[PDB]
Design a protein around this motif. Structure first.
Motif, PDB file in Angstrom:
ATOM      1  N   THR A 176       0.848  -1.184   0.000  1.00 27.22           N
ATOM      2  CA  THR A 176       0.000   0.000   0.000  1.00 27.22           C
ATOM      3  C   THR A 176       0.885   1.235   0.000  1.00 27.22           C
ATOM      4  OG1 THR A 176      -1.484  -1.249   1.473  1.00 27.22           O
ATOM      5  CG2 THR A 176      -2.077   1.022   0.967  1.00 27.22           C
ATOM      6  N   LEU A 177       0.554   2.197  -0.854  1.00 28.95           N
ATOM      7  CA  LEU A 177       1.235   3.486  -0.880  1.00 28.95           C
ATOM      8  C   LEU A 177       0.185   4.573  -0.727  1.00 28.95           C
ATOM      9  CD1 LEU A 177       3.553   5.494  -1.329  1.00 28.95           C
ATOM     10  CD2 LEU A 177       3.290   5.136  -3.776  1.00 28.95           C
ATOM     11  N   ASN A 178       0.265   5.332   0.360  1.00 29.94           N
ATOM     12  CA  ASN A 178      -0.615   6.470   0.577  1.00 29.94           C
ATOM     13  C   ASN A 178       0.219   7.663   1.007  1.00 29.94           C
ATOM     14  OD1 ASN A 178      -2.645   8.283   2.140  1.00 29.94           O
ATOM     15  ND2 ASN A 178      -3.921   6.812   1.034  1.00 29.94           N
ATOM     16  N   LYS A 179       0.007   8.799   0.350  1.00 30.76           N
ATOM     17  CA  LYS A 179       0.816   9.983   0.591  1.00 30.76           C
ATOM     18  C   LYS A 179       0.087  11.197   0.041  1.00 30.76           C
ATOM     19  CE  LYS A 179       4.828  12.411   0.762  1.00 30.76           C
ATOM     20  NZ  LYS A 179       4.997  13.105  -0.543  1.00 30.76           N
ATOM     21  N   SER A 180       0.071  12.270   0.824  1.00 30.54           N
ATOM     22  CA  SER A 180      -0.395  13.568   0.372  1.00 30.54           C
ATOM     23  C   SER A 180       0.635  14.619   0.760  1.00 30.54           C
ATOM     24  CB  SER A 180      -1.767  13.905   0.964  1.00 30.54           C
ATOM     25  OG  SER A 180      -2.654  12.812   0.818  1.00 30.54           O
ATOM     26  N   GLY A 181       0.586  15.753   0.076  1.00 28.52           N
ATOM     27  CA  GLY A 181       1.512  16.836   0.328  1.00 28.52           C
ATOM     28  C   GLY A 181       2.470  17.058  -0.831  1.00 28.52           C
ATOM     29  N   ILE A 182       2.990  18.278  -0.905  1.00 26.44           N
ATOM     30  CA  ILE A 182       3.836  18.681  -2.021  1.00 26.44           C
ATOM     31  C   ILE A 182       5.227  18.098  -1.835  1.00 26.44           C
ATOM     32  CG2 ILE A 182       4.682  20.610  -3.365  1.00 26.44           C
ATOM     33  CD1 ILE A 182       2.423  22.278  -2.381  1.00 26.44           C
ATOM     34  N   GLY A 183       5.714  17.402  -2.854  1.00 26.83           N
ATOM     35  CA  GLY A 183       7.012  16.777  -2.802  1.00 26.83           C
ATOM     36  C   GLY A 183       7.006  15.445  -3.518  1.00 26.83           C
TER      37      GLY A 183
END
Lengths: 49, 49, 75, 228, 230
Positions: E96-103
Motif C-alpha cells: 500500500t502506498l498512501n501519501k499527500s503533500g507537495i514533494g
C-alpha cells in the motif's frame, strides 16, 4: 542458362571464404592428421586455428 | 459448431491444424513475378509470430 | 519422394505423366478406399501415391490393367 | 518455479561407433547450455589412454626413411596415432612389435601383455615390400585425458631422449567427433522450447552413450560441492 | 581420474548490488565451461519478485491523467516496473502506498508489512505538486522467472478483470549483468589450475551465494537426465 540458381549469396560466401583461406604460420601449422574428424576436433578444442 | 470451434481457437483445433498441414504444400508467390521461378511451392512448418 | 521426386521421375519418364498417374492413384485411395501397399507412416494420399510409384508397385499400365481386372471381375 | 525435465527419446544407432541422441524438450536456451558443456568436457577433459612415444630402429628423426615399406615414417606415425588401445591396470605400458615377410602389418600382429588389448585388430599399421625387411618399434602407452599434440609436447619436454624416439599426438579422450544442433520442439501451449540432437562418433574402447554418461557424471561430480 | 572439486572461497561485496565472487579450484579447461554455463543459467532462470498489477483509485485506464501529479500514469507504471522488492515468506503480497503533500513520492513511503523489504529507499515514483492532491495505489507483487508480458497474461487469465486493475508487464529476473574471468590460480603445488571470478550485478534483492547455489542445482538436475537415463 544451365547454371544453378541456388547459389550461396554474401554471408554463406563470407563464411566459406573464411573457412577455405589460409595464413602462413597461424597456430599448429605443419601437423599431420588422420582426417576431417580429428581436424574439426582440433579446431573446436582451439589448439589449431 | 465447426465455425465457432475454429473461432474459439481450442487446443484440439491447433492439433487438427498440425495434422492437416503435414506435407501439403503452399505456393509462395512474390510480385513482380518476372521470371518463371517467382512461384515456388514449399511444405510449410508452423511458427508463431 | 518426400523431399525430391526425381526417383519417381526416373521410374515414370515424365513429370506430367507422373502427376497424372499419381493423381489417379490418390483419387482411388480417397474415393475407393483402396489400401496403400507401402506402409503409410502417417502421410497424406499424394505423397503415399508418389512413394508407391517411387518404389515400383504401380505404373500407368499397371494401374490400367488393375482397374480393368477389377472391372471384369465386378461385371 | 518448476523446471521441465526431458525424456531421452532416441538413440539412432547408425553403427557400433555412431549415435544420435535426440532429446526433447528443454527450457528456452538450455539446449545450448547442455550441449556446449558436454562438448567441451568430451573434447578436452575425458580420460583415456593411447600411444604417446615410439622408438623405432633405423630412424633418427621424424624425416628419415626405413626400407622395405611403401609408406614412410610420417605415415607410420599417423597410423600409430589412429590406433585405439585400452589399458586396464597400469598406466605406463611399453609394447614392441616385430614383423617380417610379404604382407601388411596389422594391429593383431603386436605382442600384448595380460593388461592391454586391441579394440580393432584389423586396423592397419603399415605394409611390407621385402620379405627380408624386419620392422621393430617400441610403442609406449601412457594415460592422460583429452588431447595433447606433439608440438606442445616437444615444447614442454626438456630431457634429452635417445635418438630414435618419436613423439605423436596423444588422443587420450576416446571420442572422435561431437557436434550438436538445437532444434525447436513443442509442448502443447509454449512453442518457445528447444530439442537437443547430439551426434557422436568415437573410436573403439567405448559405446557413445557410455561416453555421454561419463562426461555427465564428470560434470555432476564437479558441481557436487555447493548444491542443496 | 585425478580431478578435484571447487569451493566458494572468498565472497566480496563491492556494494549492495554489484558484487563479485570467486570459485576455487577449477580443473584445466573447466573454467570457461562452468563460467559460460553459469552465465546462461544465471541470466535466464533466476526467481525474483516484481510488480504485476497496480490499482490506483479513481483511475480507469492507464492512458488517463490525474491532477496533482507530474508524471503521467504510463510514467508511473514504468517507474513501478523498475521496482525491486524482496519478500521472504509468501509468494504473492499486496503493498500500500498512501501519501499527500507537495514533494516527490519515494519508494520509502510504502506502508510495508513485516515480510516485504523494499531495498531502494530513493526510487522515485511520483512528484506530488498540489497539497490537496492524494494518491492511494495498491500494488500486487507475484514471484516467477523469465519474462511474462501483458498480452499473454490477458489471454491466459481465466478470471474477470474489474476496471482499475491495470496490468503491468512482469520483469521477473533480478540478474542484469554477469561476467566471469578465468585467472591463474595460486596453488602452492599445482600450476595448471585456475579460478573463476564471477562478477554479478543484481537487483539488490538476490543473495549471490544463494543465486549460485540455485543455478548449480538447476544445472545438476538438468544433467541428471543424461546421468541416470543413458
Amino acid at each position: 542458362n544451365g547454371e544453378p540458381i541456388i547459389v550461396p549469396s554474401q554471408d554463406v560466401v563470407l563464411g566459406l571464404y573464411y573457412m577455405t583461406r589460409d595464413c602462413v604460420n597461424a597456430k599448429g601449422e605443419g601437423m599431420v592428421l588422420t582426417g576431417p574428424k580429428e581436424a574439426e576436433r582440433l579446431y573446436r578444442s582451439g589448439l589449431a586455428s | 459448431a465447426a465455425k465457432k470451434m475454429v473461432e474459439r481457437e481450442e487446443a484440439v483445433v491447433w492439433d487438427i491444424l498440425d495434422e492437416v498441414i503435414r506435407e501439403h504444400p503452399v505456393l509462395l508467390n512474390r510480385a513482380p513475378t518476372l521470371h518463371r521461378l517467382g512461384i515456388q511451392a514449399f511444405e510449410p512448418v508452423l511458427i508463431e509470430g | 519422394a518426400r523431399v525430391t521426386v526425381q526417383d519417381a521421375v526416373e521410374k515414370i519418364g515424365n513429370r506430367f505423366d507422373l502427376v497424372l498417374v499419381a493423381a489417379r492413384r490418390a483419387r482411388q485411395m480417397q474415393v475407393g478406399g483402396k489400401d496403400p501397399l507401402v506402409p503409410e507412416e502417417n502421410d497424406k494420399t499424394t505423397v503415399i501415391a508418389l512413394r508407391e510409384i517411387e518404389e515400383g508397385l504401380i505404373n500407368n499400365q499397371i494401374l490400367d490393367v488393375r482397374e480393368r481386372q477389377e472391372q471384369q471381375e465386378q461385371e | 518455479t518448476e523446471f521441465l525435465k526431458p525424456r531421452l527419446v532416441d538413440i539412432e544407432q547408425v553403427s557400433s561407433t555412431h549415435a544420435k541422441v535426440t532429446l526433447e524438450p528443454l527450457e528456452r536456451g538450455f539446449g545450448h547450455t547442455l550441449g556446449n558443456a558436454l562438448r567441451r568436457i568430451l573434447l578436452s577433459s575425458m580420460p583415456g589412454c593411447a600411444v604417446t612415444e615410439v622408438e623405432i630402429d633405423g630412424v633418427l628423426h621424424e624425416y628419415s626413411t626405413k626400407e622395405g615399406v611403401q609408406e614412410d615414417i610420417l605415415e607410420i606415425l599417423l597410423n600409430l596415432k589412429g590406433l585405439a588401445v585400452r589399458v586396464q591396470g597400469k598406466d605406463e605400458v611399453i609394447l614392441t612389435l616385430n614383423k617380417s615377410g610379404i604382407g601388411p602389418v596389422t594391429a593383431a600382429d603386436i605382442t600384448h601383455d595380460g593388461d592391454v588389448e586391441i579394440v580393432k585388430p584389423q586396423h592397419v599399421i603399415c605394409h611390407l615390400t621385402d620379405e627380408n625387411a624386419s620392422i621393430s618399434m617400441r610403442i609406449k602407452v601412457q594415460r592422460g585425458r583429452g588431447y595433447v599434440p606433439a608440438s606442445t609436447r616437444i615444447h614442454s619436454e626438456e630431457d634429452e631422449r635417445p635418438i630414435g624416439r618419436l613423439l605423436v599426438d596423444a588422443c587420450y579422450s576416446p571420442v572422435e567427433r561431437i557436434a550438436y544442433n538445437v532444434e525447436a520442439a513443442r509442448v502443447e501451449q509454449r512453442t518457445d522450447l528447444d530439442k537437443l540432437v547430439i551426434e557422436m562418433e568415437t573410436n573403439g574402447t567405448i559405446d557413445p552413450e557410455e561416453a555421454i554418461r561419463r562426461a555427465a557424471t564428470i560434470l555432476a561430480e564437479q558441481l557436487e560441492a555447493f548444491v542443496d
